[PDB]
Amino acid sequence: MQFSKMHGLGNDFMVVDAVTQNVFFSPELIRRLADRHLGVGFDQLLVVEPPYDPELDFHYRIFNADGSEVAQCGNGARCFARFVRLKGLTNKRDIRVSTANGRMVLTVTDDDLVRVNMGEPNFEPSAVPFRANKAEKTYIMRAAEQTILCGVVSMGNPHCVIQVDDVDTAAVETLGPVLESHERFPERANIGFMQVVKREHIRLRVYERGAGETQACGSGACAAVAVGIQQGLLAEEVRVELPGGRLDIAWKGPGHPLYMTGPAVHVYDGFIHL
Amino acid sequence: MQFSKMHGLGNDFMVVDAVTQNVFFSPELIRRLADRHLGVGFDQLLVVEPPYDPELDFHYRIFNADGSEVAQCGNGARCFARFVRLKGLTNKRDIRVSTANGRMVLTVTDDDLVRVNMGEPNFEPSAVPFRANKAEKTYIMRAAEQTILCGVVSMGNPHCVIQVDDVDTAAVETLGPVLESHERFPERANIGFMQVVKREHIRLRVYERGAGETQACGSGACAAVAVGIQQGLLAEEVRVELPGGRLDIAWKGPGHPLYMTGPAVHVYDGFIHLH
């Protein structure tokens, strides 16, 4: 089985062409392949399939390291788009794909970045889910003794975004866990710590739901920019610097989808025995 | 650059044929390649070279994930011997090789395992290094309130081997880091927890110097059997069961080299563009 190893800002994938190859997985096999010493070594497996539909170019599925299928992953989307172009499975700039989260068009740019339509940010508390009276630009939250001002938004997953003076001194290790499982977040939240450098440039650290600080959370980058836009702090195109590198977010506000442009690195190609 | 990913039940290798292609590394490139997320992901890099002496079939060298060269007897030997055969660099089953540790003959058995001559175990405390009055078969060591009885031996690297009733109930997690950096080991020690099942069979867990428990430590398996042989507990041929699988150790005692036989698994082949 031919595969490619890729990463989107350090979130790493085994990617497989199941369009031109017969490719068979079981949950146990995926677990073995994910193992960094005994296998290929990856966070997620992305399998590329034919569309079975004349209005689609591909289908793709993503499996986690435990061998179960995953719903939305836009690091996934970027690796997918570059993979099908690098492997010659398509030559299209605008790639139509179906996924477990529905249908999408991905655009591969001239500088080999991939632009993802992440949908319209939903600020409605019930959609997050977030306990509040109603939607507000800024909420006051208590995190034990500390008073926190934040914005809260759903990108399909829940985000709490806090402005900080300096991401490097932000109390991520202490405030992150307290907010991630705060009583006001029935399904927990990703906690973003956002430093506004210019209206066009933020630095960001994200304490991810059930994971703690990660190198790059693309959905947190979208959420921080959506919140910062709504709060009057940010322009409509914003450079986001995460620990793993750069994303560029574009959003014209309510009534519009938010776009996330980011890299996908191709590390090596392999063939596995089996 | 073509490469193969392999392992010998424990630490994994990126293995590269520098015979049929030009292979160029820098310490920083090795570090980037070793990175599990951003690179290939491996503990060590094994480079297979043509021989520089007409008396040898190959030379090989090994670098760690920091990009510096490792010189440990038998390290990567099983993967090397299986690699040269599976890559069609040789058809020999007795393979003469030079390394940073000198020359060796490696033997690929009929069931595709590899037999490595690991040299003669050295029980001299100065060679470990180990602080002691003189070589003894058993030492008493202090670990918290607990008295530990152990044997101590060098296989090129330092080992402390403790006999336990059951590896599963062995206090590896607590006793292991205490012995690993014990003040009596100036350069730290690999800590073996050895359950003698019978004279020909042990179970073993190893808490490795600067890494904690691993799935298989070949040199730890050697050391455990050497110590068990010296202590009168073990036969000359011993099956060793580690969490990662099985090694077999043969040693006729002082005056003889110790031999370790074990598998190498080929996981996948790859190609990486290096600019």
| H, E, C per residue of chain A | CEEEEEEECCEEEEEEECCCCCCCCCHHHHHHHHCCCCCCCCCEEEEEECCCCCCCCEEEEEEECCCCEECCCHHHHHHHHHHHHHCCCCCCCEEEEEECCEEEEEEECCCCCEEEECCCCECCHHHCCCCCCCCCCCEEEEECCEEEEEEEEECCCEEEEEEECCHHHCCHHHHHHHHHCCCCCCCCCEEEEEEEEECCEEEEEEEECCCEECCCCHHHHHHHHHHHHHCCCCCCEEEEEECCEEEEEEECCCCCCEEEEECCEEEEEEEECC
Which of A272, A242, A271, A265 lies closest to A81 in space, CA to CA? Answer: A265
Residue B269 contacts A where some CB pair is shorter than 8 Å: yes
Do the Cβ atoms of B267 and A38 come within 8 Å? yes
B164/B193 same-domain check: yes
Residues B129, B57 share a domain = no
What three-state secondary structure class fits B224? helix
B219 lies in some domain: yes
Residue B163: CB atoms within 10 A of its CB come to 20
Beta bridge partners of A225: none
To probe the interface with A, which of B1, B3, B4, B5 has the most A CB atoms within 10 Å? B5
Check whether residue A59 and residue A158 sit in a common domain: no
Identify whether B221 is part of a domain: yes
Whether A21 is covered by a domain: the verdict is: yes
The reply to whether B144 falls in a domain is no
Do A165 and A241 lie in a common domain?
yes
Domain that holds residue B196: 115-139+150-261
Q: Is A59 in the same domain as A119?
A: no
Whether B238 maps to a domain, the answer reads yes
Do A55 and A97 belong to one domain? Answer: yes
Least CA distance to A268: which residue of chain B? B272
B73 belongs to the catalytic site: yes
Domain holding A67: CATH number?
Answer: 3.10.310.10
Residues 57-96 of A with CB under 8 A from B: none
Q: Is residue B196 part of a domain?
A: yes
Is residue A144 situated within a structural domain?
no
Chain A / chain B CB contacts < 8 angstroms: 58
Q: Count the domains in chain A.
A: 2
Residues A252 and A271 in one domain: no
**Could you tell me if A27 and A67 are in contact, meaning their C-beta atoms sit under 8 angstroms apart?**
yes
Known binding residue B64? Answer is yes
| Of A96, A30, A98, residue with least CA distance to A65 | A30
- The experimental technique used to determine this model is X-ray
Phi-psi category of A223—alpha, beta or left, where left has phi over 0 and alpha has psi -120 to 50? alpha
The answer to whether the CB of A247 falls within 8 A of the CB of A114 is no
Q: Within this chain, do residues A127 and A252 fall inside the same structural domain, yes or no?
A: yes
- Residue A211 makes CB contacts below 8 A (sequence gap 6+) with none
Same domain, A52 and A122: no
B44 among annotated binding-site residues: yes
Compute the distance between CA of residue A16 and CA of residue A121 in angstroms, rounded to an integer.
31
* Residues A3 and A100 placed together within one structural domain of the fold: yes
Q: Annotated catalytic residue: which of A79, A150, A217, A222?
A: A217
For residues A5 and A133, state if they share a domain. Answer: no
Closest CA to B192 of B159, B168, B225: B159
Query: Is A145 inside a domain boundary?
Result: no
Query: Pick from B112, B138, B109, B113: which is nearest to B123 by CA?
Result: B138
Is A218 assigned to a binding site?
Answer: yes
Examine the domain organization and report whether A268 and A187 are in the same domain: no
